[PDB]
Scaffold this active site. Sequence first.
Site, mmCIF file in Angstrom:
data_model
loop_
_atom_site.group_PDB
_atom_site.id
_atom_site.type_symbol
_atom_site.label_atom_id
_atom_site.label_comp_id
_atom_site.label_asym_id
_atom_site.label_seq_id
_atom_site.Cartn_x
_atom_site.Cartn_y
_atom_site.Cartn_z
ATOM 1 N N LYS C 164 0.799 -1.199 0.000
ATOM 2 C CA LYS C 164 0.000 0.000 0.000
ATOM 3 C C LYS C 164 0.846 1.269 0.000
ATOM 4 O O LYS C 164 1.655 1.511 0.909
ATOM 5 C CB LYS C 164 -0.893 0.054 1.215
ATOM 6 C CG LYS C 164 -2.277 0.598 0.907
ATOM 7 C CD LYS C 164 -3.364 -0.187 1.619
ATOM 8 C CE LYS C 164 -2.881 -1.560 2.050
ATOM 9 N NZ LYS C 164 -2.324 -2.335 0.930
ATOM 10 N N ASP C 193 -1.148 -0.446 -4.255
ATOM 11 C CA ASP C 193 -2.518 -0.111 -3.973
ATOM 12 C C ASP C 193 -2.648 1.245 -3.360
ATOM 13 O O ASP C 193 -2.216 1.477 -2.239
ATOM 14 C CB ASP C 193 -3.128 -1.184 -3.053
ATOM 15 C CG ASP C 193 -4.614 -1.146 -2.893
ATOM 16 O OD1 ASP C 193 -5.148 -0.009 -3.248
ATOM 17 O OD2 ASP C 193 -5.247 -2.090 -2.482
ATOM 18 N N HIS C 295 -10.078 -10.931 -4.466
ATOM 19 C CA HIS C 295 -9.922 -10.024 -3.339
ATOM 20 C C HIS C 295 -10.445 -10.665 -2.065
ATOM 21 O O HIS C 295 -11.646 -10.905 -1.951
ATOM 22 C CB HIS C 295 -10.541 -8.633 -3.562
ATOM 23 C CG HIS C 295 -10.347 -7.717 -2.373
ATOM 24 N ND1 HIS C 295 -11.422 -7.150 -1.688
ATOM 25 C CD2 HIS C 295 -9.209 -7.316 -1.749
ATOM 26 C CE1 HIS C 295 -10.914 -6.418 -0.706
ATOM 27 N NE2 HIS C 295 -9.594 -6.483 -0.724
HETATM 28 C C1 LIG Z 1 -5.626 -3.016 0.523
HETATM 29 C C2 LIG Z 1 -6.868 -3.851 0.147
HETATM 30 O O1 LIG Z 1 -7.703 -2.969 -0.643
HETATM 31 C C3 LIG Z 1 -6.416 -5.090 -0.653
HETATM 32 O O2 LIG Z 1 -5.917 -4.983 -1.737
HETATM 33 O O3 LIG Z 1 -6.521 -6.212 -0.240
HETATM 34 C C4 LIG Z 1 -7.686 -4.178 1.409
HETATM 35 C C5 LIG Z 1 -8.869 -3.500 1.664
HETATM 36 C C6 LIG Z 1 -9.609 -3.799 2.798
HETATM 37 C C7 LIG Z 1 -9.168 -4.776 3.676
HETATM 38 C C8 LIG Z 1 -7.988 -5.460 3.417
HETATM 39 C C9 LIG Z 1 -7.249 -5.166 2.281
HETATM 40 MG MG LIG Z 2 -7.119 -2.829 -2.908
#
Ligand SMILES: C[C@@](O)(C(=O)O)c1ccccc1
Ligand SMILES: [Mg+2]
Lengths: 357, 357, 357, 357
Positions: C164, C193, C295
């Site tokens: 991130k 991200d 995801h």
């Molecule tokens: C950073 C994130 O957007 C991902 O890519 O997984 C994420 C969002 C929310 C909770 C955990 C992880």
């Molecule tokens: Mg993400």
Amino acid sequence: EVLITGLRTRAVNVPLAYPVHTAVGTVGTAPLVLIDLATSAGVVGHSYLFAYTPVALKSLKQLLDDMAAMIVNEPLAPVSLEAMLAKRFCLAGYTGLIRMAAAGIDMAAWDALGKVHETPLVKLLGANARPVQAYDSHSLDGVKLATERAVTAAELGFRAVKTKIGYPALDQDLAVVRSIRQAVGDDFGIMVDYNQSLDVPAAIKRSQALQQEGVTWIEEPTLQHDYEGHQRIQSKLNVPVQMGENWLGPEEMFKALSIGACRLAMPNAMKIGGVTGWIRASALAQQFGIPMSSHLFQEISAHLLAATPTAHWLERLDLAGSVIEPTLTFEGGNAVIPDLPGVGIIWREKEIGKYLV
Amino acid sequence: EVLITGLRTRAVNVPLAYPVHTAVGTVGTAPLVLIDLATSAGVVGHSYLFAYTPVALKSLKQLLDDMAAMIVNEPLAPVSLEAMLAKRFCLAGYTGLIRMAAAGIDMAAWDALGKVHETPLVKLLGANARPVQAYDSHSLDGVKLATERAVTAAELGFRAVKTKIGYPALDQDLAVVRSIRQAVGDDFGIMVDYNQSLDVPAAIKRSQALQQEGVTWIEEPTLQHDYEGHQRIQSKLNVPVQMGENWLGPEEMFKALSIGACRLAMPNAMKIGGVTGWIRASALAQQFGIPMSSHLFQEISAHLLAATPTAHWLERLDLAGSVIEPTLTFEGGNAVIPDLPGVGIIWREKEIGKYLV
Amino acid sequence: EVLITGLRTRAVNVPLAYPVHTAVGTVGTAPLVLIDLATSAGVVGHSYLFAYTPVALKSLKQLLDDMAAMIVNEPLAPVSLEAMLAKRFCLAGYTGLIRMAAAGIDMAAWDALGKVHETPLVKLLGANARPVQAYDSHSLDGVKLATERAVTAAELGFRAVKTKIGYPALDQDLAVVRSIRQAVGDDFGIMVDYNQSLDVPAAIKRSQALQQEGVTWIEEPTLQHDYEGHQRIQSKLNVPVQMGENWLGPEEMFKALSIGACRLAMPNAMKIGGVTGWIRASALAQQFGIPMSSHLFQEISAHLLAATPTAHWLERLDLAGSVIEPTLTFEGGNAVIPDLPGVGIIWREKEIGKYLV
Amino acid sequence: EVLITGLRTRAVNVPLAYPVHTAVGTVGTAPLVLIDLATSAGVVGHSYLFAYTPVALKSLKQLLDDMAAMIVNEPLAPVSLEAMLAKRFCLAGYTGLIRMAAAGIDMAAWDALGKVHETPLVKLLGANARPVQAYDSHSLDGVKLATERAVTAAELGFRAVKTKIGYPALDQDLAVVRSIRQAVGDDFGIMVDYNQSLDVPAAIKRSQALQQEGVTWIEEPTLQHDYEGHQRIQSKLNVPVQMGENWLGPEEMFKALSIGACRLAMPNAMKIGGVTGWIRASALAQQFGIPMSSHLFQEISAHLLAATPTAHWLERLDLAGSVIEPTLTFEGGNAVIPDLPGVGIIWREKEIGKYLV
Ligand SMILES: C[C@@](O)(C(=O)O)c1ccccc1
Ligand SMILES: [Mg+2]
Ligand SMILES: C[C@@](O)(C(=O)O)c1ccccc1
Ligand SMILES: C[C@@](O)(C(=O)O)c1ccccc1
Ligand SMILES: C[C@@](O)(C(=O)O)c1ccccc1
Ligand SMILES: [Mg+2]
Ligand SMILES: [Mg+2]
Ligand SMILES: [Mg+2]
């Protein structure tokens, strides 16, 4: 006045030379269907078909044998013939194998119509025989063999070869490309073929890298039917995206061109609908400002391209050489149309018998 | 764990009843290829294929016989299987006959996967068996017979029949349509099928007239591949343009839907890619707000449609009845899925032997 | 025949490890809702839900408790179930929390349908279990910890981590990215991200810089619902814009894809509509030529992706590990589906009791 | 200077009168969440929320109770507040239930900001109180009751009622519509609501018929999220397609308007984002040349619409009357804003206690 009196087909499995190791799969021998179309005029027309895979060989033949009935006693009028077949299969699907078979018939028909007139095909089409720059078509041969095969090409006067890439790593793709360039110099063409083996994003990454290396063209980067996809890839490049070997009919061509899927095209004589379909694709390319090259069928493609307003490159890839006479010739990397009526296809009967399936 | 152990095919020419006199050509008997797919589990899957024309019958069979090698010893995983076939034919053209054959395999595969689980297909798909309103599908039968065939339909509880038009004169088209309406009343469906027999301008003239008469839908007015054309016709109507029987793969569907070529769709189980392709087409229709009906294969279509979010109409047109058990039934113009594992296809061995080609 | 007989929910607050310091906000523990769906067959299905924030934890649970009535005595048919819920909430809004709850039910339903058949989910879906390359998902951890966490990743065999970014200064973004690259070398993936934390113009500036550094992909640069915005950003890049974690339903996906908002997608099993919604999103990606990754929900995502034609990457981010068995495993940076019926989710009852809210 | 000091919520199930038998489902009582927002200034703001279904009642409340922490000690600045909530839920999804809860807070906030200033909301917004033509909103009541309910409407001075259609047969839809017209005459409005119960093609058939009968508008013919679909329907009509009750945020509105999905709009005060979101939607409608009407929340909608440049119709549908004072009044079919600070919402404490959940 001139009637079609018969249809004979022979399915062979011909020896090649090297073996089109392709950007996805590979080919040892060549499965073909040779076509003889008899006429009331005492002239036999010829053509052949490429089956890509032996899986489809018996099928394609059986299909032609069964269509013979539809065409016998019909007049030797390719344009009319073609229309008639299109109505007869509108339900089953005038594409795929059916269309390929129709194309084989058309090609023979036009060949016979050329002999009837004791005139070379290109001439009958209304044009003058001219040589066509061609490029030697190789496969997915690796660094060494790719390099070896190009020195020979150029040694034979070719001014460009086409190689197959799409290795597990972009790095390999490049390796192959650089070795050839070193071997041949900056004044040489290098066309690359990904054989529809990549996704859109990956094609963008790989094509850009190559763009740097200086390839002549990037051919069939993604799945062939994904026109839009190809448009997306092209939109990110300067170098030309090449396509069209899989267009079944001028109707599929029209679609792809309508969205700006590519900068160049290379229709396949069989898949595009034989002579009849070609004439039509050629008018399209013209209006669309698309330089048109060929795919396989160097014999007929030579004549075809000379009647193409936007004629580009002929692809040298001799599928049929073991069973036909060496009428088509290459002078200094340019294909020369033989001065024989029709297409110039003469069978080698004794050899044919060697490869009969 | 579960492997495909064999592939058997039989080509028959089955008796029908009436004979689909179509808006362009007509059909006396029915050419099919019956498929048995053997598994390590002691379960045999079934499917059949429709060849439209006998010209393609031996060809289609020969093609499947030759593909058997590709699939034997492979796991009984339709989704994986399908992917594998798509890579293996990317050069030859994963469409046409090749695609139809692939679809026949997929259908059997899914049938066998249903028996493995002692579960009805629809159930395996994650849905509940429900009846589906169906319509009786007739042909280009003329005023009298069309009228006779509808009274019977309704007599059997049907709430809509489909007839074939496209007579030399719009006047005839209307005649046929009016006679049926008189015979059955305003609370009855009348679907018409032009069988791709008209040009765009003519389709506009004819469709508008019919619109007046009150047809349920106008199906395949022009050449099937002319998406844009269909869009033009539709754009001039209120009544729905129906299409999709000729879409070879969800990929052709996507294209047509992308331009708003139609208001309704009716994919063909074989041409769309079997169960596997259906699932995909169904997701498309959904997103596109397109009520999806079926084309032929009432047996599997019944299950398929119940798992379709935008399920519309099932088409009754029994190609295979002479060689299979009467498991699929109709209760008050609604198709009822049998409570048998798989698709519910049970062969009539003694009859089969009667029609073997 | 198989009925849903009950719905039990437990809301826990599970311990993680590191704590998803995100490109906008950050996460210490993990709020989940564990779901048990009872059946007449003596089989219990499982799933869990992620609440992102504890603010929504009690709410999400209460919502499921209240929906239990709607689903009891209904047949165990996820596809039908789903349709029914969609009609029941069409007024309130079949999205948001309501949709997430529906997704949790679907997931359990499919799990139970897998146990009913003593078959692993992926298998029931019609595909073969295959490993899926996955990437280790980190947070907004700063130069040092980001670097530390990647060496370990790769040490464990991972071939790509996701970090991130979105620091107050582009310079920081780069810093983080360079340190990891140095630490791991050029043959390693780096996905970044931004967590929807930038405006369009700023995303263009930052993405271009990174493009230079060589990131694998740029994920959720701007506000998630701003499709057009994302299209604008993408239009200025070579590198792929990644998105889709926030798509509530395949219907939101369709919209984004329709405008070419991205080059890659990564639907969220919960938000996309569980198994049922996935199948649909997967068909979309396919037609759209969009490589699809996942995801969260590594457990079900593993099975899901193997049935995805355009399957890309699995994201490793273990939310639930403290309360479930370690059935899902990673072999050389590839996720391995367990050979257990259903999804393979087995609870750790004693632990669960530790985190009950 | 002015801080939010507390948040109190009460969930009731209020008695209605008739019971919104809707074009898909129906409603006996009304589930609401009443909101009290305390301030450092000794002023309490009010709002209420509609839960559509009791399934979501406890959930919606629990959600607000848990959000109270986020907002306490924050300044009483609705615009700032709103922004802050949007960042805090960007991961969970700033839509659905979450957004509805945010909207309830905004509404109260603005009410309290109105009391702080001893000014009526509309006035604070910068506009003058004016009456707004409203229409009496009925349900799917059948021929007789629909007809009875309209005579009364008009008897009370209303100049248009809205009825729910979408009967199994178009014929019924018409029946209902004709009976009302006969009962009331040609100088009366008739708005119809299909409640998203039809497919696109069917909506085209039904809407055209009605068009003939002379309806004021056709509201939510198809699935609400199907913008494109709505555009297709509208494209075939002269009469206005009405929509927008389900738009969660001005962001969903923008999308629909961008494609010309409708000719009229009627945002829902709760779903559109309270006062804050309204102001924004109103600017959109303006630029888009879209006459904007309201959906539920007649109390606040009255003030809102007077500050709307393209203000159209107010919908009379009293959800909350049993628990609040009759401040909003109707004079000759026009809503009159009370001359009370804020929105004019005064609770009926003794009654509230009667319906507490
Ligand atoms: C950073 C994130 O957007 C991902 O890519 O997984 C994420 C969002 C929310 C909770 C955990 C992880
Ligand atoms: Mg993400
Ligand atoms: C590589 C190729 O696509 C070409 O460009 O010729 C090719 C495809 C199929 C057979 C031979 C050659
Ligand atoms: C008329 C037809 O297109 C149909 O609608 O079913 C049809 C085509 C081919 C065979 C049978 C029926
Ligand atoms: C019919 C309706 O959509 C309306 O127009 O008000 C409506 C929907 C939900 C609750 C009440 C009323
Ligand atoms: Mg090629
Ligand atoms: Mg038809
Ligand atoms: Mg409404």
